[PDB]
Amino acid sequence: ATPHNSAQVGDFAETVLMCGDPLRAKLIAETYLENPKLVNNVRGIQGYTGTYKGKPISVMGHGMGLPSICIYAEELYSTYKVKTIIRVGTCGAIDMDIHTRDIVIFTSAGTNSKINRIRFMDHDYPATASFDVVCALVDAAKELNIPAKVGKGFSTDLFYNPQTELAQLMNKFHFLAVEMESAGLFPIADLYGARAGCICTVSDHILHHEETTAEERQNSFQNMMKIALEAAIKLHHH
Amino acid sequence: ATPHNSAQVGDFAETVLMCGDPLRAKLIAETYLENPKLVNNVRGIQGYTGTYKGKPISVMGHGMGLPSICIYAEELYSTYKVKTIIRVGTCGAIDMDIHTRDIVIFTSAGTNSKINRIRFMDHDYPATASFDVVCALVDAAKELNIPAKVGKGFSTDLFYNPQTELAQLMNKFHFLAVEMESAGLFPIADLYGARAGCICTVSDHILHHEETTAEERQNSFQNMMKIALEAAIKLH
Amino acid sequence: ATPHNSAQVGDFAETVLMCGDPLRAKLIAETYLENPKLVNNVRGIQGYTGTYKGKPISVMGHGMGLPSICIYAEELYSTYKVKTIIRVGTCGAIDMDIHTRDIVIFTSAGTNSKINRIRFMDHDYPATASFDVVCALVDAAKELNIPAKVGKGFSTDLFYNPQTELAQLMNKFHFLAVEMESAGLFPIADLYGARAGCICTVSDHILHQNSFQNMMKIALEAAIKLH
Amino acid sequence: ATPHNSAQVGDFAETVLMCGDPLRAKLIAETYLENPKLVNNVRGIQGYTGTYKGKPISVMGHGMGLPSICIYAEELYSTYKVKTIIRVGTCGAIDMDIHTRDIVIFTSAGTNSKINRIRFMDHDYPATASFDVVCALVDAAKELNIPAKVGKGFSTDLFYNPQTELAQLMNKFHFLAVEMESAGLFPIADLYGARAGCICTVSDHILHHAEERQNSFQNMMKIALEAAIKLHH
Amino acid sequence: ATPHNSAQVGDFAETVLMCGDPLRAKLIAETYLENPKLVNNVRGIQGYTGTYKGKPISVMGHGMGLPSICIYAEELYSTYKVKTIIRVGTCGAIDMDIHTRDIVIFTSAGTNSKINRIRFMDHDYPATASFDVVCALVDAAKELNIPAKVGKGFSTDLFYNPQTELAQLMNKFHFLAVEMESAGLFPIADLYGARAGCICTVSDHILHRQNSFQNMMKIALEAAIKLHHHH
Amino acid sequence: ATPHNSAQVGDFAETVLMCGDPLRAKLIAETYLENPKLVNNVRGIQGYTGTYKGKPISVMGHGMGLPSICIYAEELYSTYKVKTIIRVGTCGAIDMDIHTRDIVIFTSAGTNSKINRIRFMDHDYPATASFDVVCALVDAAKELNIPAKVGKGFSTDLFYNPQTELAQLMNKFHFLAVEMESAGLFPIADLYGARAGCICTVSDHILHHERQNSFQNMMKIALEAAIKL
Ligand SMILES: Nc1ncnc2c(CN3C[C@H](CO)[C@@H](O)C3)c[nH]c12
Ligand SMILES: Nc1ncnc2c(CN3C[C@H](CO)[C@@H](O)C3)c[nH]c12
Ligand SMILES: Nc1ncnc2c(CN3C[C@H](CO)[C@@H](O)C3)c[nH]c12
Ligand SMILES: Nc1ncnc2c(CN3C[C@H](CO)[C@@H](O)C3)c[nH]c12
Ligand SMILES: Nc1ncnc2c(CN3C[C@H](CO)[C@@H](O)C3)c[nH]c12
Ligand SMILES: Nc1ncnc2c(CN3C[C@H](CO)[C@@H](O)C3)c[nH]c12
């Protein structure tokens, strides 16, 4: 029904977990959902709908980077009447106390893209996560006794950033981590009167080269997924 | 000890409430604080320190506009070793459902100022309220049975905005209200690894003319004031 | 009559002197104006109207910063029918040559604010002092034998400037001094077909009564000249 | 050996065709190459290496949008020593005489992204296709007798573009077609001394209104593949 | 000695009048200067040096546009050690009451060019005429009884302006007239601790060579005499 | 017919060669054109129209910098119904391999001007030479066995560039040369559904600091290209 989505109105739960890597979405469905149906596989994006603790949930990839999340998120919010998108991703740490495997929940997301300036008369849009979503995520992590840090992210357009000075600027202002998606997501939810959040697990540090193995990874990705899901259950009221 | 402040390190409590109107800072001090002391009156700014329910609090004006609050906020965080500034202000409603006398708590603030671009290599800084402060403010509002709305603010450099289409664009995106300070406060607190938040009472609507003829005013200021004072305690 | 001004049309004279410190404002009124009256104290801003050598003059605070002066200037030119604003302030010297207590007349003011670009389709607006005013101020100083430099100012949004290299660059281009207001004032005066100028006394160097009175005398004399 | 790419140096050929759709990637490998090995499937991206009419060729997805292609392309030119990339995607037509099924070769691409201004001191970078590639793409289209239009493209950050007056502005300036990638790619080619180009098939008109596709996309593919052969020598 | 100027240090006077039409520079030389000599004609730019009432003066073309004038102004002030440049051009009128062949003296110049942003860390540089020069032009006009308006100009990069709304905006803020040079000129003078100004005869109205041109030239030349005396 | 051009419609050929120096326009018309008539000398601009190998070709100065060429170019495409403009100029080399008296043909040109952002909703316009024209100039140079380099140029607003680090930046991206005109030219051509191109002779080097015989090579190529059109 869209160029990027073969599903119809109703095929998506009104809460969707989203991540960059479509194989992670497949994994989330195969691992945590009851009765998962493939609802969208246009461009291999792996969108599934099922339940978690009896409540309807959906999981899908959004591809890497703001332009990509901006396509999917808009479609979900407008065509498929989705109410909440929680991005579950990875990130690169900025703060010196945050390490690999750590978990981060974003209040907001800076960016170097021009997308919001196009949306917002060339002024400063504050890409902000839904207050609710943050709470839900913070409480889920507490209840699950998993430590989670709370603060600003940065959505870069350039994984390989030629501005080498930028990391330390972000560390001066106590940014927590870098990903490529959240600043595209937050204003879009605002635009549709809907809600959005972002929770991330740290995959590498950008201010030193760390130790990440070839599998773990998974163990901390698992916690993030668990928090996301419990939080998703709290949102649903109403 | 600064060009804008005749107090010495220690003269301010570690938590400070600020507002545009220095006469408002006077009122807060003369009304709510116990044993208040004038600690700074350079340029008639009205800086006071006392305690609230026995807890050290300070209050001071911050002028109108990002430049002004940027001077005072930085000085306070820097020289005076302040950990938390809550801005207690007024604002112009954007959202059709927020009405005069309603109380707004900001999660963050957008802006048309250039200050954060200057601070941040020409990129997009999200001026964000400190999560702890938003919580405290929301909790205190609940506790006191005062309805309070949570969301985005816009800090304008231009009260009389020659961009007439912008009011509606802000409304398209569900901005709650407009003031002139928060977008400059929030990053400064980050800089010093301190905390900041903004609570506001609605004094006008920028999308029609509404309830200016009302006497809250003080009954709505008072509510905001008490939410702010109570939140301040809860951050100590 | 405005959210920033309890006064009525006519409560202000056609000429207003403005400064950042409202405590300075009241001192000015008291020190120079016959029968001065408080005409606005919304936000402790201290606006007074009286006369000077028989001629009507107002004085009021404008707060620090472009957004603040923009509020007050527009209202005075708009609602209050003010014809001429002269900012009588302080400034941070830039030029290697300029010294603490020196008097500076701005011909224009550059800026790092975005306000002018928002007013002017994102192009470079030259915030220029009214030429008539610069004349009145320079002649005044000549007749009074007060030395006064004439040139560019820079209105900054960031008193504590994270751009540490900007001071040398302003020196390189012979900017005379830094304040935080003029660049906002001048474009507004043009907008209303009115006049504006700024005169400063140096208080500090960003690189390396006496003057206060001289500045006041200069401004007040110039105000007579522009009738 | 990169976080987006499990392959080692040499696993990719010197010439790499790229598209947005990693399923279209897979399909090209299966359809056009002999003995296609899968060399990278990190994030489902479908990187294949085989040969076509003898010479070595690779094919991989690049996701949608500048930030995505910038990741892959840099990695390809940098780690995997790739010499030539030809993007073989789709596009939204702008010009009034460009229709669905029609095939466009881009000389350059403009953009509303800020990427290039970040690379190029906040000035204007002309994201230009490599002169070789464009010739080759055109030469091939003549040889294979395929009608192909040459000119400017536009790479957008914003598929659902809130600036609705931009489409006509691009018509005014005779921009052929919109996609989301070339503006990112080309400057990177430049940066590593390498070469890039773009051929696209029209999937929609942005100024008005499943099987060709397998005719015009079929045609596009032949032009690209034949051009690749001319370039690897 | 420069890529755009065959002359050597000393060949130009400390005061130089510049216009954009090189054919005009030749006429000015003939019409006003005693013993004018060709000093530079790289690119047909018609550079001349003579005296006017016994005080040394030069006149050169500067071509149209900010990039051109920036080249010529920087060379004069650095290589040729010029102290004062006065642009004596034409301009299209903006203000409703400024009419064809009126005389405008610019206090400053707005611009749609990025040049001053590039020079000044992407902030607002106010391309301001040197106060002395402005004063010398004003006084001269009063001395000669020539009415002359005073206020801001705008230097465009786009003679044919695709931003059709821009003229009316400029009118809103009381810009007097448009040219294509002064915004380049002013900041360069400042860079070299020198002086610049611009005087303009209105040739057209964007909203709605012996008389006005003669008058502009006298004011520019009489002002050139006042400057030089201090210093 | 215009503030800068005295000629009427018909006076210019469909193809015009344009340079910065009017003394070169003059020297080109005298040398390569048969029966050159001076069609426009407003502001000393030196506009001629003749024939070459039996075909109408004009030649005119365009001044220095984008603002100037943007006036002339838009008048020629607009009032004079010109179809093709080939700029034949000088340029300072950027790439460490390119040298004095080399001949660069521009595919496209970057700029530090604001002119294209004004024209283009504050986005990035690729000032691209017309593909036909680049072919023609490339083909013509084979024929005459003259080495021609092909790629990106850069039009600066500032000959004396206070951005001292820019030169290397351009080298890091293998920009061949800097001039001051092509970035203005190309989008006007597009705007008028017309064609433009640009070819230069290298007069200086901006990173590691005749005329004639390289200028002849340049002139021959451009004229030869003009024929193929
Ligand atoms: N170093 C670094 N930079 C930017 N982003 C990330 C991320 C987060 N996501 C990974 C994907 C790109 O590798 C993109 O979706 C953001 C992990 N480490 C990162
Ligand atoms: N309409 C409108 N615009 C900008 N700001 C405000 C405010 C908040 N503050 C009041 C002061 C200006 O009136 C300034 O401190 C912002 C209330 N209504 C406003
Ligand atoms: N160093 C420095 N920077 C910016 N401005 C000033 C001023 C002028 N006014 C003083 C107020 C702040 O100290 C501000 O309104 C401008 C004096 N020294 C200054
Ligand atoms: N209308 C429109 N806009 C932007 N791009 C395209 C494309 C080309 N690609 C398809 C993907 C978006 O659907 C993106 O990778 C570019 C076809 N039609 C498009
Ligand atoms: N309408 C209009 N626009 C921009 N500039 C001018 C000028 C001033 N000079 C004329 C030259 C262009 O014709 C240029 O050098 C500036 C006169 N009328 C003008
Ligand atoms: N170093 C350098 N910078 C900018 N441009 C050029 C040119 C090319 N043209 C010569 C004229 C400036 O001297 C201008 O038309 C561009 C040769 N060398 C140049």
TrEMBL record, chain F:
One of its GO terms (biological process) is uridine catabolic process. Pfam families: PNP_UDP_1. One of its GO terms (cellular component) is cytosol. InterPro entries: DeoD-type (IPR004402), Nucleoside_phosphorylase_d (IPR000845), Nucleoside_phosphorylase_sf (IPR035994). One of its GO terms (molecular function) is uridine phosphorylase activity. Keywords: Glycosyltransferase, Transferase. Residues 16-220 form the Nucleoside phosphorylase domain. PANTHER family: FI09636P-RELATED, URIDINE PHOSPHORYLASE. This is Purine nucleoside phosphorylase, putative. It comes from Trichomonas vaginalis (strain ATCC PRA-98 / G3).
